[PDB]
Swiss-Prot record, chain A:
Organism, scientific name: Homo sapiens
Compartment annotation: Secreted; Target cell membrane
PTM info: All cysteine residues are assumed to be cross-linked to one another. Individual modules containing an even number of conserved cysteine residues are supposed to have disulfide linkages only within the same module.
Name of protein: Complement component C6
Cysteine disulfide partners in this protein: 1-40, 3-44
Shown residues in whole-protein numbering: 22 to 70 of 934
Gene name in the database record: C6
Function recorded in the entry: Component of the membrane attack complex (MAC), a multiprotein complex activated by the complement cascade, which inserts into a target cell membrane and forms a pore, leading to target cell membrane rupture and cell lysis. The MAC is initiated by proteolytic cleavage of C5 into complement C5b in response to the classical, alternative, lectin and GZMK complement pathways. The complement pathways consist in a cascade of proteins that leads to phagocytosis and breakdown of pathogens and signaling that strengthens the adaptive immune system.
Glycosylation, residue list: 8, 11, 17
Domain TSP type-1: 1-49
Disease link: Complement component 6 deficiency: A rare defect of the complement classical pathway associated with susceptibility to severe recurrent infections, predominantly by Neisseria gonorrhoeae or Neisseria meningitidis.
Family per similarity comment: Belongs to the complement C6/C7/C8/C9 family.
UniProtKB/Swiss-Prot annotation, chain B:
Post-translational modification: C-, N- and O-glycosylated. O-glycosylated with core 1 or possibly core 8 glycans.
Described function: Component of the membrane attack complex (MAC), a multiprotein complex activated by the complement cascade, which inserts into a target cell membrane and forms a pore, leading to target cell membrane rupture and cell lysis. The MAC is initiated by proteolytic cleavage of C5 into complement C5b in response to the classical, alternative, lectin and GZMK complement pathways. The complement pathways consist in a cascade of proteins that leads to phagocytosis and breakdown of pathogens and signaling that strengthens the adaptive immune system. C7 serves as a membrane anchor.
Record note on quaternary structure: Monomer or dimer; as a C5b-7 complex it can also form multimeric rosettes. Component of the membrane attack complex (MAC), composed of complement C5b, C6, C7, C8A, C8B, C8G and multiple copies of the pore-forming subunit C9.
Family note: Belongs to the complement C6/C7/C8/C9 family.
The encoding gene: C7
Cystine crosslinks: 3-18, 20-29
Domain (EGF-like) ranges: 1-30
Protein's name according to its UniProt entry: Complement component C7
Originating organism: Homo sapiens (Human)
Disease: Complement component 7 deficiency: A rare defect of the complement classical pathway associated with susceptibility to severe recurrent infections, predominantly by Neisseria gonorrhoeae or Neisseria meningitidis.
Glycosylation: residue positions: 46
Protein location: Secreted; Target cell membrane
Curated annotation (Swiss-Prot), chain C:
Portion held of the full protein: 362 to 409 of 843
Compartments (UniProt record): Secreted; Target cell membrane
Record PTM: C-, N- and O-glycosylated. O-glycosylated with core 1 or possibly core 8 glycans.
Gene encoding the protein: C7
Function: Component of the membrane attack complex (MAC), a multiprotein complex activated by the complement cascade, which inserts into a target cell membrane and forms a pore, leading to target cell membrane rupture and cell lysis. The MAC is initiated by proteolytic cleavage of C5 into complement C5b in response to the classical, alternative, lectin and GZMK complement pathways. The complement pathways consist in a cascade of proteins that leads to phagocytosis and breakdown of pathogens and signaling that strengthens the adaptive immune system. C7 serves as a membrane anchor.
Family: Belongs to the complement C6/C7/C8/C9 family.
Listed name of the protein: Complement component C7
Subunit annotation: Monomer or dimer; as a C5b-7 complex it can also form multimeric rosettes. Component of the membrane attack complex (MAC), composed of complement C5b, C6, C7, C8A, C8B, C8G and multiple copies of the pore-forming subunit C9.
Disease the record associates with this protein: Complement component 7 deficiency: A rare defect of the complement classical pathway associated with susceptibility to severe recurrent infections, predominantly by Neisseria gonorrhoeae or Neisseria meningitidis.
Species this protein is from: Homo sapiens (Human)
Curated annotation (Swiss-Prot), chain D:
Illness the protein is tied to: Complement component 6 deficiency: A rare defect of the complement classical pathway associated with susceptibility to severe recurrent infections, predominantly by Neisseria gonorrhoeae or Neisseria meningitidis.
Entire protein: shown range: 414 to 454 of 934
Species of the source: Homo sapiens
Family, as annotated: Belongs to the complement C6/C7/C8/C9 family.
Subunit structure as annotated in this protein's UniProt entry: Component of the membrane attack complex (MAC), composed of complement C5b, C6, C7, C8A, C8B, C8G and multiple copies of the pore-forming subunit C9.
Cell compartments where the protein resides: Secreted; Target cell membrane
Primary role: Component of the membrane attack complex (MAC), a multiprotein complex activated by the complement cascade, which inserts into a target cell membrane and forms a pore, leading to target cell membrane rupture and cell lysis. The MAC is initiated by proteolytic cleavage of C5 into complement C5b in response to the classical, alternative, lectin and GZMK complement pathways. The complement pathways consist in a cascade of proteins that leads to phagocytosis and breakdown of pathogens and signaling that strengthens the adaptive immune system.
Protein name: Complement component C6
Gene symbol of the encoding locus: C6
PTM section of the record: All cysteine residues are assumed to be cross-linked to one another. Individual modules containing an even number of conserved cysteine residues are supposed to have disulfide linkages only within the same module.
Length: 49, 48, 48, 41
């Protein structure tokens, strides 16, 4: 799959504001015949944390 | 009144200037884009 | 009908404190082919 | 005599190609002792 087709979302507001915190983003995944056939569900990570 | 985009103010004699963060620019640091890791939001800062 | 576009930016910003005046301008002369620094010029700066 | 013959035909095709790569490096090093010519090196 060309997983770079999907969205460069901003990182979510930092979960803990000032200690050992985390943030995440996701691809805004819209499914299409392309996504179904070109192994996108298999190889693309849906959300980064 | 604080610079945007994590820039730190300083007082020129009777005046304010901004130490902007890299490749973000202008007097308030409003224009351009930051480089390196970013935390998002706006960290708080005091008035006098 | 066909359309095509390209963009590139490079910025690089070596900054130095301490060093002999020539070695400083030597090390800080940015290499497109080696952006961190030519190892001998850097070692010479680190001597000066 | 009257005769008439008629047909319709349709076709479709697609192709796709994709590539991406990513790299990251870090180095951290502390030197203590040396002449700073070779402590630099």
């Amino acid at each position: 799959c060309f997983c770079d087709h999907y969205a460069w979302t901003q990182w979510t507001s930092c979960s803990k504001t000032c200690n050992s915190g985390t943030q995440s983003r996701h691809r805004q995944i819209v499914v299409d015949k392309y996504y179904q056939e070109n192994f996108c569900e298999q190889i693309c990570s849906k959300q980064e944390t | 009144r604080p610079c945007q985009n994590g820039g730190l103010a300083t007082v020129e004699g009777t005046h304010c200037l901004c130490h902007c963060k890299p490749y973000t620019f202008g007097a308030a640091c409003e224009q351009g884009v930051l480089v390196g890791n970013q935390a998002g939001g706006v960290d708080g800062g005091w008035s006098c | 009908a066909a359309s095509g576009t390209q963009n590139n930016v490079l910025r690089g910003e070596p900054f130095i404190r301490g060093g002999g005046a020539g070695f400083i301008s030597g090390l800080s002369y940015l290499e497109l082919d080696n952006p961190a620094g030519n190892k001998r010029r850097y070692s010479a700066w680190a001597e000066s | 005599t009257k005769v008439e013959h008629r047909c319709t035909t349709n076709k479709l095709s697609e192709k796709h190609e994709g590539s991406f790569i990513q790299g990251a490096e870090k180095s951290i090093s502390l030197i203590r002792g040396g002449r700073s010519e070779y402590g630099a090196a």
